[PDB]
């Protein structure tokens, strides 16, 4: 109809989704209210300006921001001096999502740089000369797989990598993040990711890991950093994805997990919050929403007959609306929420989330939902590794030619 | 000695007592990627840090240097590791180091390395005497600081300091009943002390939660806690629950109450309740109200729940295709 608003966030009924504080104000309600007011302005902007809303993903702008950042960064990034392989990964993945080719000059230079970050004893550090750490190791491996050349693959010293993972393994099934470092669910995921991709998983490498991860699921349904902690999307993604790699998703109460993640989508904003009673954030478009494709695959593997054949169990449209209207920086790059400054981390994750929300795929069945102009469509991302499905297949296949270190 | 921010701070390359050491520039390769254009101060400190790390110089000056490297980038885990090596080799007073870590955490509380360092110090000293009060101070500035709560659980568990935590939880819930971190802590304390099987405890908890739900019917945390503590035994195991929730439908409705009703129905149906059909329909009716009116953001979930209940609880569900 003519009076019908095609954008979910701009429909008149949508205003009913605003927060109800029951006249009891606390820090939480006050903070939530501030965000909703700012988001409401964004939504109402077209209306108060008397213009037809047009949701456009600023590709040219994002590309410029990425292309330059892949080479040089301002001192604003000094705080990430110990996370350079992450900068390589976030940027390369964002470019891959935007379907921008990686020049071989760039690819070779990234390879050589990552070789310098690689430790003599296995794993990659946050920069040349830094001790190895599982987070930079996960990022380095993902970045090399995105490049996907024989050179990229050859950078990874597999025997040492495996030795590194073993040196971090704990008796209770968990892993340290690095020697003399902390333990939390991120390590299980980082280890499972790199070990599965490079084909170095020995019979006992992950003994007890699945059980340890299962102990992280709490009364909320989600997964916390360590047993006993509040459920959080970042850790939940790590927990479920690692279990999926280990083929042990069944260790979790998938029903309570699904109920928890779906509740993390904000009724007004449309994006996801990281934990109950906190604020919406663009990066959770991936950490939280990315759980749905994983849950779908797990539930479907159990032959769940009630599973939709065209959509994920979240409001795909509303998430896309949130990202496109509230998380783009005019100058390029994406962000947490209006008022926050862009950064490569949120650029990588807002886009990864957008892609997931646009593409549904359950084997033979395939169904897309592209809000705004059709040029907004991105390349698909693998829900477990957050790299192109083709890069995943390509890498695993190549590494399966090599034998698991030791034999 | 010389703070990284004092107006008289001097670059290391201009310090006499450092004249014997050649700084070690960063090895980024012939043609760098993701190259950070560091400021003078930053690059200078790190060039000298690289020098001492490479020589494995375990000295007092190296120790003081790590403090500067840390303030420049507290996320540099390699620097923290070397600092811990120096704390042991130089036999540095660990309480003085505790004073240092408490100051650093006060300024950068959302960092992993600072909390891990504090933990190692506590482990080394085998002294948790300053913990609960320190953490309480951080939580007073950000009541939801994840690292703070995680460190708090570690301290409490490892040193069996359970005695006053429920009181602390009650205090914070009074300040902000919507603080999910506090509800999670509440569950942590109870499950590790009395447990929830003790009928008196469970009863008390549910009375408390329902009371909070009445004061703030839209606070999702109270709702998740109530479901959290009852769901494992089975919601259908508590027959009075349903009746009592329905009594809140008028002046205390919310998509949260509606969702709970569906969960009660779902379990009732799972445990062969009476009026199988009457229950199923009540449930599907609510799933539709939620998917189409009261909780549309979750329309895909609610449609799926409705479809699942239908798939396994309709009168036709156990009937052979031939009938």
């Amino acid at each position: 109809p003519v009076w019908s608003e095609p954008l979910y966030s701009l429909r008149p009924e949508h205003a009913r989704e605003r927060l109800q504080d029951d006249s009891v104000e606390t820090v939480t309600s006050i903070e939530q209210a501030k965000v909703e007011e700012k988001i409401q302005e964004v939504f109402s902007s077209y209306k108060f300006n008397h213009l037809v809303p047009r949701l456009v993903l600023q590709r040219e702008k994002h590309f410029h921001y990425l292309k330059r950042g892949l080479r040089q960064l301002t001192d604003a990034y000094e705080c990430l001096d110990a996370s350079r392989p992450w900068l390589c990964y976030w940027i390369l993945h964002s470019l891959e999502l935007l379907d921008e080719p990686i020049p071989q000059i760039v690819a070779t230079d990234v390879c050589q740089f990552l070789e310098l970050c690689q430790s003599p004893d296995g794993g990659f550090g946050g920069g040349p000369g830094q001790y190895p750490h599982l987070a930079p190791t996960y990022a380095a491996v993902n970045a090399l797989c995105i490049i996907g050349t024989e050179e990229a693959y050859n950078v990874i010293n597999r025997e040492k990598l495996l030795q590194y993972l073993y040196s971090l393994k704990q008796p209770d099934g968990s892993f340290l993040m690095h020697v003399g470092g902390e333990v939390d669910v991120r390590s299980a995921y980082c280890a499972a990711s790199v070990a599965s991709l490079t084909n170095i998983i020995t019979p006992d490498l992950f003994e007890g890991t699945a059980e340890w991860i299962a102990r992280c699921q709490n009364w909320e349904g989600g997964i916390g950093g360590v047993p006993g902690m509040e459920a959080h999307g970042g850790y939940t993604f790590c927990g479920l994805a690692a279990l999926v790699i280990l083929k042990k998703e069944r260790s979790l109460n998938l029903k309570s997990l699904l109920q928890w993640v779906t509740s993390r989508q904000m009724r007004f904003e449309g994006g996801f919050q990281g934990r109950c009673n906190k604020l919406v954030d663009g990066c959770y478009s991936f950490w939280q929403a990315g759980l749905l494709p994983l849950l779908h695959r797990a539930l479907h593997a159990q032959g769940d007959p009630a599973l939709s054949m065209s959509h994920w169990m979240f409001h795909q449209q509303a998430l896309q609306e949130y990202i496109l209207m509230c998380c783009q920086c005019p100058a390029g790059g994406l962000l947490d929420k209006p008022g926050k400054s862009r950064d490569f981390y949120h650029t990588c994750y807002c886009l990864s989330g957008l892609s997931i929300a646009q593409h549904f795929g359950s084997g033979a069945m395939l169904h897309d939902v592209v809000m705004g102009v059709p040029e907004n469509v991105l390349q698909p991302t693998h829900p477990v590794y957050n790299i192109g499905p083709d890069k995943v297949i390509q890498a695993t296949t190549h590494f399966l030619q090599k034998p698991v270190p030791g034999f | 000695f010389l703070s990284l921010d004092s107006p008289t701070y001097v670059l290391y390359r201009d310090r006499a007592e450092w004249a014997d050491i050649d700084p070690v520039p960063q090895n980024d390769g012939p043609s760098p990627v993701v190259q950070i254009i560091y400021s003078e101060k930053f690059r200078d400190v790190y060039d000298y840090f690289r020098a001492v790390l490479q020589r494995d110089e375990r000295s007092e000056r190296a120790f003081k240097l790590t403090r500067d490297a840390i303030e420049l980038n507290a996320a540099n885990y390699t620097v923290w590791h070397f600092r811990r090596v120096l704390l042991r080799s130089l036999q540095k007073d660990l309480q003085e180091e505790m004073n240092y870590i408490i100051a650093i955490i006060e300024e950068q509380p959302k960092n992993y390395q600072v909390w891990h360092h504090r933990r190692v110090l506590v482990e080394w000293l085998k002294d948790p005497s300053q913990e609960l009060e320190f953490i309480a101070d951080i939580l007073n500035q950000d009541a939801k600081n994840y690292h703070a709560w995680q460190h708090r659980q570690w301290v409490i568990q490892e040193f069996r300091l359970w005695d006053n935590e429920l009181q602390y939880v009650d205090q914070l819930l009074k300040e902000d009943v919507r603080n999910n971190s506090v509800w999670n802590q509440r569950h942590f304390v109870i499950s590790n002390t009395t447990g929830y099987s003790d009928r008196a405890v469970l009863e008390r908890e549910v009375q408390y939660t329902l009371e909070m739900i009445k004061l703030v019917p839209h606070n999702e945390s109270a709702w998740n806690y109530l479901k959290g503590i009852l769901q494992d035994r089975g919601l259908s195991r508590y027959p009075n629950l349903l009746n009592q929730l329905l009594d809140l439908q008028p002046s205390h409705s919310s998509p949260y109450l509606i969702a709970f009703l569906v969960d009660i129905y779902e379990d009732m149906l799972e445990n062969q309740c009476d009026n199988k059909e009457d229950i199923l329909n009540k449930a599907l009716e609510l799933c539709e109200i939620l998917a189409k009116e009261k909780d549309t953001i979750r329309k895909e979930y609610w449609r799926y729940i409705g479809r699942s209940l239908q798939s396994k609880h309709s009168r036709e569900s156990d009937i052979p295709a031939s009938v």
């Binding site: 705080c79 996370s83 992450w86 750490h133 987070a135 930079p136 993040m177 991120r186 970042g234 954030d281 990066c283 947490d336 926050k340 950064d343 981390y345 949120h346 | 996320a75 959302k110 960092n111 992993y112």
Partner: peptide, 6 residues
């Protein structure tokens, strides 16, 4: 502000 992940 920035999101910490490591």
């Amino acid at each position: 502000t920035k999101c910490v992940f490591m």
